[PDB]
Amino acid sequence: KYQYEFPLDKAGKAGAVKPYRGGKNDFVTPVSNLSGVAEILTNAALKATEAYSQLGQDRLGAVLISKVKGWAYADREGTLFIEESDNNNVWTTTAAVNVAAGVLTATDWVYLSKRYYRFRYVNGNLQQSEFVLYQSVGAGEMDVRVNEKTPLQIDFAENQTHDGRLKVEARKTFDFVFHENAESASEGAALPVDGAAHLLVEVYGTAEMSEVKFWGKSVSGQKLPIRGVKTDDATTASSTLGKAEAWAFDIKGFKEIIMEIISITGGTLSVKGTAVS
Amino acid sequence: VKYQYEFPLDKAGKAGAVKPYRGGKNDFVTPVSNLSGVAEILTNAALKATEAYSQLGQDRLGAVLISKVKGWAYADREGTLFIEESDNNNVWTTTAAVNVAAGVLTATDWVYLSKRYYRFRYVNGNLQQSEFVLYQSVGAGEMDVRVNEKTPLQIDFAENQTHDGRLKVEARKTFDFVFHENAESASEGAALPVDGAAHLLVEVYGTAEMSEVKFWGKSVSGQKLPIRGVKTDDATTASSTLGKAEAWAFDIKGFKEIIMEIISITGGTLSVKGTAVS
Amino acid sequence: MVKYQYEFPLDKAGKAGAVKPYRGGKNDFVTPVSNLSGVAEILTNAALKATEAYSQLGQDRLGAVLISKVKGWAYADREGTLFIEESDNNNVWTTTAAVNVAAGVLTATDWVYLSKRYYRFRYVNGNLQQSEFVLYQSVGAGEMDVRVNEKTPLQIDFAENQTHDGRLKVEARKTFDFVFHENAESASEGAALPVDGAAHLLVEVYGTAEMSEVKFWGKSVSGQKLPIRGVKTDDATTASSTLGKAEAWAFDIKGFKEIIMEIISITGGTLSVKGTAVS
Amino acid sequence: KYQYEFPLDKAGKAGAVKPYRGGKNDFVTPVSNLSGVAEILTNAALKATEAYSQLGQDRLGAVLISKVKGWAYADREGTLFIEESDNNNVWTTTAAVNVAAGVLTATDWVYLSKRYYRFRYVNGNLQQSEFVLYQSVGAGEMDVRVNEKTPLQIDFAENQTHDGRLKVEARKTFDFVFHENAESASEGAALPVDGAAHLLVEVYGTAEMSEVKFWGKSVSGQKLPIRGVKTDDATTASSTLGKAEAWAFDIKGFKEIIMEIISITGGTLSVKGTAVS
Amino acid sequence: YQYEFPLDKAGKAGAVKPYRGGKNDFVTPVSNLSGVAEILTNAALKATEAYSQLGQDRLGAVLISKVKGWAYADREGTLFIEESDNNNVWTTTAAVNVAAGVLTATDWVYLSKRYYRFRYVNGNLQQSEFVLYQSVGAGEMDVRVNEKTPLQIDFAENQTHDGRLKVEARKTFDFVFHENAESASEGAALPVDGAAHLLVEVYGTAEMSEVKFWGKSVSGQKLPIRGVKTDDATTASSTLGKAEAWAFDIKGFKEIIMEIISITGGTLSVKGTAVS
């Protein structure tokens, strides 16, 4: 017999309900998810350095336990361990929380992975005169629909922002091979520009003599001479007879870039670059 | 079979599946769980080496409309748990597959079902089990919810969508535009809508023996204003050209429209096409 | 009238309840529940002739349970079409959703959020007689307030249409037009462009005025006017003012608070000064 | 007494449950939050311009009412008012919704603040022959944890985007005081660059003579001369003897910028700027 | 009470409502306990008089996580939500002014200590009407949001500017090529990693020194690069000087090297900032 009393309906029928609406002419069953219920594991005061160990709790049964939370109160300091075991014999510690003297201490919800869970409480160097340890468990996952015309109010971790701004990377890089160890004249491979703005082209190899002609393609598909800027001396040219050098191009608006070996003698030539946004 | 739980009695001696609460334990509440938290044990029969357990097909269609299924397996030896679906309860397709290591509780994800029938199928590995249990949970339905907006929820981007803690973004857009296609007479041709583009590359090409293209933008008044372009081959700056088989780069920031007008043309055709970039 | 194979467990005193035991000792109880959205009614399992229709009687949403939404499942050995329909008068129907039901394939509708008073399912069989057919209907109601408690940030995912090569598509550029002067017929500073993070400005000067002088100004922190230089589009002239018209001037305005195009003098008609600022 | 029938378990016991699983060997209680339940307030047809007024409903009781929603159906047009009162005597309208002839009309959920709520319905200029008015109420707030390992797929409002692209602002602006009404030589305050790329500096005041020297600091902390471009004539210099003028600086890669007054006579000088990203 | 449980077809009472067109299905209306309230008091207080609820232990079969209050009075007062670990010494968690004749609600207060209570202090006028209600909650349901269905987000006001998301696209890092070098070496190679601009400072006691400016692209061979000196806009691929800074366009490079070719009569440092 408890202190609560179930109310009666108009015909004298008891129910675990509350009345509502202005005339108290409707009924509703008050409920709590099982995550809101708690079991008291122990209130036995521990000696200095003495431990309480809950018997292994099997998660597997009619209710499939997914998670566990603890509350500890003691008049002296100790440590609450949440532990897990796949064999109910060898235990690993999933969480450990300091329980200060005279301070209600709560764990987080711990999402379980192994088959068995337990609480283990180790008292500190002073004898408790007062101790309670409570355990809650939960289960399952309900589908929910957020109102389509009520946006979720979001913001970003302070680590993902600077001065209230989201940190973004707008620049992308990719390398491209026009020619690798070419030993004769050819256009080689055409770089697809794909929104890139800037291109750095390296010309290098054993070739005693070589000529590289700088080309872009726009809408017609015909090759158009483009000018590059040589890194060492700022020479601007639409071709080179040289090597062990690099050329910078503004390629905004082009569809393709071609570095054509027009002629080559007495060795090989590689033509490779990096395109940037 | 009586369990160790006992329903409490109210003040009038009435049993209920309730717990007391408030300081004086003078109120009651029914503990509940959505059915997604309930599980059925499918089998605990130990399998021989390579032997399979197959659940009979479960019809999703019923008084309770099953939307999703989740499994747990524990075995002292290794095996594989398959979640399968069938529209005819005869031919099975595998929706999910999980390796179950020896002595390790293994869980599937929630699998959202599409076909009419679902089942678990467990294939034991090369060693006979001495201990095996397989649990199945199902869910149904969808609760409409209004999220209390007192504090925003913190969101994050996939590690695949970030680089050095930065969100990867593409700010640049590209579009091609035809000013003139095989024009055989003088006209302004089509006006490019700038729409926040910053840079334009214009190619002039065709059979025309002679042609003049004049470079224009429009700002707020709608009157044509001469603009200057830079020719790709020699870095010539000009507001028009008598040439072809050439391309001209323009800064178009702030313009509403760009026009490449053929002023004159003889002895063939001329195309004028470009690519605008932001 | 109706006895199933489920069995209610007993408490320590032998009392049945619609509960499951839990905790290691099975010394606690919990009532398994499902929101009504998870429950279904079978509307029909009567096999239809070729082209024959099933029409559910209009369902009134208004009642002790206020129906907000409806979802359907259909299975048939032959192809057909499932319609979710609505009516304010239970007589004239509009189709809210229609789904093709392939032969031998469980077909689900979306949840349909209802607006009219009455809802129904209508199923029209295709050109082959069914030998097997079931049609299920689920309904829901209400809206629960919730508080979302997260221990980690929520991970977000973008539509494939919102991304390109694993990058979020963004527009960083904004454009706005501004009127400094419209058909001015006398000298004045006119209106001050608020720069507000814009970087580039194009200014057009046009009108009937026979003579005019426009002076180019920016304001920084003090609010004192500072002469600024523009580049004329037609010939790349750089200047801090103009006596001309039917011309446009490009300005780098990074760091300025305001831009002013002052008509210093004007005779023999009117003058407009208008521009576009770009970020 | 209704057409539904409670099923029986294997031992013949009735329950407000449904069977589930393949063998129908498990049970579940179908539930609805009370927000899904409705009361019919009235079906009494109104004269032209006649009102229905619900008696004030007290939110305070065993169920604490948080919110209210209405549905109205009538063969003629009218207006549904949701009203609140702190004294159950003076009524303020929180929401008013037009109810068209022959069209089910729903309000939004209205979150209540005063002690009492009611519906008031005012019929239009034509006598009703058919009218029903339904009220739903809610209460409370459930704590929930959203699945931490599953991405939410989100979609941007058309107002958040342009041509399918998310609208972003990459540029930031901040004002900085190097000197305010200085009347003597000093370095003044050092601008922290913090990723800014461009600086506009204004020099102004009564000083008869002044020299301002333009400095940046890199990693060592030593001052390095920098060059600015004067806005009116494009003069490039690392210092100025002038005032009522402004200087533009490229500050990319600098840690700090200093506008040093080297000398000043016969009045005061202010040096202020705007840094941009 | 005025409510009546309906009967099923066999005459069985239940806390249910009928539904579907034929009223041939049943459902149990429920409310989470957070929707339920207890009336603590309706005893009218004298001027300045206080009501104090006895300490409520959160620890029990139902583990109380949170509490919310409503107060109504015909005269003004103050509602305090308080917490205690010992049910003796109280700290105030929340305080809400209650205006005359105005229903006043607290927020949900998420409890930390073992015991909670409401304390109400009446103002300077005797109440003739007063009620005080208390709701509690417990637990936390795991949920899957909008599994098949796209949802909209809205950005924090702090992250937005004229309807645009504020982003920082520019990143900065400092790099040491050389610190107090006393002999010739390449020093450390800056990884460019998408940086576009580099500022390099050269400083120290060295009487004489040469720094050569290098980039590496795809081949891995050093390529001469040109810098612009901050003081006079000199362009060069090397310097014999110090107490100077050089700006480089490094777009497209993989690495940057500031090589000390020679050094006499002291030390030299070479340090920079790379930006995107």
Shared domain for E105 and E192, answered yes or no, is no
CA distances from D8 to B208, D5, D12, E17 (A): 92, 9, 5, 19
Same domain, A131 and A200: no
- The residue behind tokens 């393949």 is D22
CA gap C257, A93 in Å, rounded: 60
3-class state of residue D100 by DSSP: coil
Following DSSP, what letter does each residue of E97-156 receive, concatenated? EE-TT--EEPPPEE--SSEEEEEEEE-SS--S-EEEEEEEE---EEEEESTTS-B-EEE-
Six-digit token string for C57: 């009687």
Phi-psi region of D261 (alpha: psi -120 to 50; beta: other; left: phi over 0): beta
Q: Verify whether the Cβ–Cβ distance E20 to C59 is below 8 Å.
A: yes
DSSP, res D149 = T
Distance (Å, rounded) from C-alpha A248 to C-alpha A241? 16
Place of tokens 């004229």: E162
Contact list in D for residue A18 (CB cut-off 8 A) is 62-63
Which residue on chain B is closest to A146 by alpha carbon? B145
Domain residues for the domain of A239 are 173-276
Could you count the other beta carbons within 10 Å of the beta carbon of residue C14?
A: 7
In angstroms, the separation between the Cα of residue A244 and the nearest Cα of chain D is 29
Sort strands A110-111 and A116-123 into parallel, antiparallel or unpaired. Answer: unpaired
CA angle B112, B114, B120 (to 5 degrees): 70
**Same domain for B126 and B53:** yes
Establish if E130 belongs to a structural domain.
yes
Report which of A259, A216, A219 is spatially closest to residue A240, judged by C-alpha positions: A259
Give the residue among D186, C249, A24 at the shortest CA–CA distance from C240: C249
Residue A257 shares a structural domain with residue A177: yes
Beta bridge mates, C178: C275
* Å between E59 CA and nearest CA of chain A: 7
Interface test mutation site (partner C, options D5, D27, D155, D230, max chain C beta carbons within 10 A): D27
Torsion angle defined by CA atoms of residues E225, E230, E232 and E238, in that order, rounded to the nearest 10 degrees: -30
For residue A34, the chain D residues in CB contact (below 8 A) are: none
Q: Which of C143, E228, A146, A31 lies closest to D137 in space, CA to CA?
A: C143
**Chains that contact B by 3+ CB pairs under 8 Å?**
A, C, D, E
Beta pairing, strands A142-146 & E141-145: parallel
Residues 6+ apart with CB under 8 A from D199: C255, D191, D248, D249, D251, D257, D273, D274, D275, D276
Mutation site, E27, E34, E63, E159, interface C, largest C CB count within 10 A: E27
Which residues of chain B neighbour D20 with C-beta distances below 8 Å?
A: 35, 62-64, 66, 138, 140
Q: Are residues B74 and B135 in the same domain?
A: yes
The whole-angstrom separation of Cα C8 and Cα D6 is 14
Token pair listed for D259: 């506008």
Length of chain C: 279
Taking alpha carbons only, the member of D186, D203, D206 closest to residue D237 is D203
Greatest alpha-carbon span in chain E: 108
Alpha-carbon distance D236 to D230, whole Å?
7
Within a 13 Å sphere around the CA of C153, how many CA atoms are in the beta-carbon half?
16
Asked whether the beta carbons of B156 and C154 are under 8 A apart, the reply is yes
Residue type, E7: L
Q: Which residue has the tokens 């032997």?
A: B51
Contacts of C133 in chain B (CB under 8 A): none
Q: How many domains does chain B fold into?
A: 2
- Whether the Cβ atoms of residue C66 and residue D134 lie closer than 8 Å to each other: yes
* Number of other CB atoms surrounding residue A214 within 10 Å: 24
Tokens of C134: 């079931």
Whole-Å CA distances, A272 to A256, B65, B211, D137: 14, 61, 38, 70
**Which distant-in-sequence residues (6+ apart) come within 8 Å of C220 by Cβ?**
C226, C255, C256, C257, D200, D202, D246, D272, D273, D274
Q: Answer whether residue B78 is part of any domain.
A: yes
Helix (H, G, I), strand (E, B) or coil at E41: strand
Q: A69 near A135, Cβ under 8 Å?
A: yes
Cβ atoms of D117 and D55 closer than 8 Å: no
Within-domain flag for E166:
no
Q: What is the CATH number of the domain that holds A194?
A: 2.60.120.380
Q: D65 and A20 in contact by Cβ < 8 A?
A: yes
Q: Can you state the percent helix, strand and coil of chain E, rounding each to 5?
A: 0, 55, 45
Instruction: Tell me the β-bridge partners of A246.
Output: A202
Note whether A118 and A53 are within 8 A (CB).
yes
Resolution (A): 2.1
DSSP bridge pairs for C242: C214
CB-nearest to E225 from A18, A173, A231 is: A231
| CB contact at 8 A, E84 and E115 | yes
D68-80 in b/e form (b: 16+ CB < 10 A) is bbbbbbbebbbbb
Cβ separation A62–C170 shorter than 8 A: no
Establish if D225 belongs to a structural domain.
yes
CATH of the domain at E69: 2.60.120.510
* Residue C146 with chain E: CB contacts under 8 Å: 143
In sequence order, what are the beta bridge partners of A30? E31
CB A32 within 8 Å of CB B30: yes
Q: Supply B192's token pair.
A: 């490019």
- Contacts of residue B64, Cβ cutoff 8 Å, sequence gap at least 6: B35, B138, B140, C34, C38, C39, C40, D18, D19, D20, D28
Contact between chains at C170 and A168 (C-beta distance less than 8 A): yes
Chain C residues with CB under 8 Å of a chain E CB are 1, 33, 36, 39, 41, 56-60, 63-65, 67, 110, 139, 144, 146-147, 149, 156, 159, 170, 172, 174, 196
Q: State the Cα–Cα distance between residues E19 and C60, nearest whole angstrom.
A: 10
B103 to A113: CB separation less than 8 angstroms, yes or no:
no
Residue A266 token pair: 């007495």
Q: Which amino acid is at D161?
A: T
Half-sphere exposure (CA, 13 Å, Cβ side) for B40? 21
> Nearest CA to D256 among D178, D186, D181?
D178
For residue A141, the chain D residues in CB contact (below 8 A) are 147
8 Å CB contact between E226 and E234: no
Q: Across the interface, do C145 and B143 touch by the CB < 8 Å criterion?
A: no
Residues in Cβ contact with E130 at an 8 Å cutoff, skipping those fewer than 6 apart: E41, E42, E43, E44, E45, E71, E72, E73, E74, E120, E122
Strands A191-192 and A256-265: antiparallel
The token pair at E40 is 């603590």
Q: Could you tell me which residues come within 8 angstroms of residue A190 by beta carbon, excluding any fewer than 6 positions away?
A: A217, A256, A257, A258
**Out of E33, E144, E147, closest to residue B29 by CB:** E33
Specify the CATH number for the domain of residue D213. Answer: 2.60.120
Q: Is residue E164 part of a domain?
A: no
Q: Is E62–B32 a contact, with Cβ atoms under 8 angstroms apart?
A: no
Which of C114, C140, C166 is at the close of a domain?
Answer: C140
**What single DSSP character describes residue E276?**
-
Method: X-ray
The CA distances from residue D125 to B182, D49, D101, in Å, are 69, 6, 12
Distance separating alpha carbons of residues E267 and C200, to the nearest angstrom: 46
In B101-253, DSSP assigns E strands to 106-107, 111-112, 117-124, 132-139, 143-147, 153-157, 162-163, 166-170, 174-183, 192-193, 199-205, 210-218, 224-226, 229-231, 237-238, 240-241, 246-251
Tokens matching residue A197: 């703005």
DSSP state of A2: -
Cβ contacts of E30 on chain C, cutoff 8 Å: 33
DSSP code of B37?
Answer: G
The residue among A242, A245, A258 whose CA lies nearest residue A209 is A242
Residues of A with CB under 8 A from a CB of D: 18-22, 24-26, 28-29, 31, 33, 109, 141, 144, 151-152, 162-163, 165, 168, 170
Q: What does each C-alpha distance from B227 to B232, B259, C233, C240 come to in angstroms? A: 16, 10, 5, 19
Give the C-alpha separation, B238 to B253, whole Å: 18
Is the torsion defined by CA of E10, E13, E16, E22 positive or negative? Answer: positive
Looking only at the bridges linking them, the beta strands covering B68-75 and C112-113 are: unpaired
Using CB atoms within 10 A of its CB, is residue E129 exposed (0-12), middle (13-18) or buried (19+)? exposed
H or E element in which residue E240 lies:
none
Domain assignment present for residue C168? The answer is no
Residue C94 C-alpha, separation from nearest chain B C-alpha, in angstroms = 25
Domain boundary among D88, D121, D138: D138
Asked if residue D120 belongs to a domain, the reply is yes
Instruction: Output the CA angle D118-E42-A12, nearest 5 degrees.
Output: 70
- E40 and E131 belong to one structural domain: yes
Q: What gap in Å lies between CA A248 and CA A200, rounded to an integer?
A: 5
- Which one of D9, D17, D18, D20 makes the best mutation probe of the B interface by having the most chain B beta carbons within 10 Å? D20
Distance, in angstroms, between D12 CA and closest chain A CA? 21
Distance CA E167, CA A161 (A): 8
**DSSP SS3 for D258:** strand
Pairing of strands B143-147, A142-146: parallel
Tokens representing C45 are: 């399992």
DSSP reduced 3-state for E34: helix
Angle at A86 between CA A80 and CA A89, to 5 degrees: 70
Please tell me the distance in Å from D47's CA to the nearest CA on chain E: 30
The answer to whether the CB of A51 falls within 8 A of the CB of E54 is: no
- Kindly determine whether residue A39 and residue C28, on different chains, have CB atoms separated by under 8 Å: yes
Please tell me whether residues B181 and B126 are part of one structural domain: no
| DSSP run (H or E) holding A112 | none
Indicate yes or no: CB of B58 within 8 angstroms of CB of D21: yes
Q: Are the CB atoms for B262 and B206 separated by under 8 Å? A: no
Residues in chain A: 277
- Long-range (24+ apart) CB contacts under 8 A made by E88-94 are E90/E117, E90/E119
> In whole angstroms, how far apart are CA B171 and each of A163, A254, B199, C69, C163?
21, 17, 14, 41, 11
For chain E, the residue count is: 276
Which token pair is D276? 């941009």
Beta bridge partners of B164: none
The answer to whether D277 and E170 are in contact (CB under 8 A) is: yes
- Structure tokens that stand for D134 in this block: 């339904």
Which of C279, C144, C272, C120 is CA-nearest to residue C207? Answer: C272
Q: C175, exposed or middle or buried, with CB in 10 Å at 0-12, 13-18, 19+?
A: middle
User: Could you tell me if C135 and C204 lie in one domain?
Assistant: no
Closest Cα partner for C70 from C124, C113, C40? C113
Nearest to D223 by CA among D256, D264, D184, D188: D256
Q: Which of D17, D252, D257, D276 to mutate to test the interface with E (most CBs of E within 10 A)?
A: D252
Q: What are residue E175's DSSP bridge partners?
A: E272
Query: Does A74 reside within a domain?
Result: yes
Residues E126 and E189 in one domain: no
Pairs of residues, one from chain C and one from chain D, whose beta carbons lie less than 8 Å apart:
261
CA atoms within 13 A on the CB side of E189: 12
Q: Taking CB atoms and an 8 Å cut-off, how many pairs form between chains B and D? A: 43
Minimal CA–CA distance to C102: which of C133, C122, C78?
Answer: C78
Residue with tokens 């089942």: B119
Q: Residues of C with CB below 8 A from B3's CB?
A: 9-12, 21, 26-27, 29
Return the closest-CA partner of residue C278 out of C175, C161, C182: C175
Question: In terms of domains, do E107 and E191 share one?
Answer: no
| Residue A259: partners with Cβ closer than 8 Å, 6 or more residues away | A178, A179, A188, A201, A203, A212, A213, A214, A215, A271, A273
Q: Which of D135, D122, D71 is nearest to D93 (CA)?
A: D122
Could you give the C-alpha distances from B199 to A176, B239, B252, in angstroms and in order?
24, 16, 6
Q: What is the 3-state secondary structure (H, E, C) of chain C?
A: CCECCCCCCECCCCCECCCEEECCCCCEEEEEEEEHHHECEEEECCCCCCCCEEECCCEECCCCECCCEEEEEEEECCCEEEEEEEECCCCCCEEEEEEEECCCCCEECCCEECCCCEEEEEEEECCCCCCCEEEEEEEECCCEEEEECCCCCEEEEECHHHEECCEEEEECCCEEEEEEEEEECCCECCCCEECCCCCEEEEEEECCCCEEEEEEEEECCCCCEEECCEEECCCCCEECEECCCCEEEEEECCCCCEEEEEEEEEECCCEEEEEEEEC
Residue D169 to residue E164, Cβ atoms within 8 A? yes
H-type helices in chain B, by residue range? none
Q: Tokens for E194?
A: 């998408």
Domain boundary among E137, E162, E191: E137
- Overall size of chain D counted in residues: 277
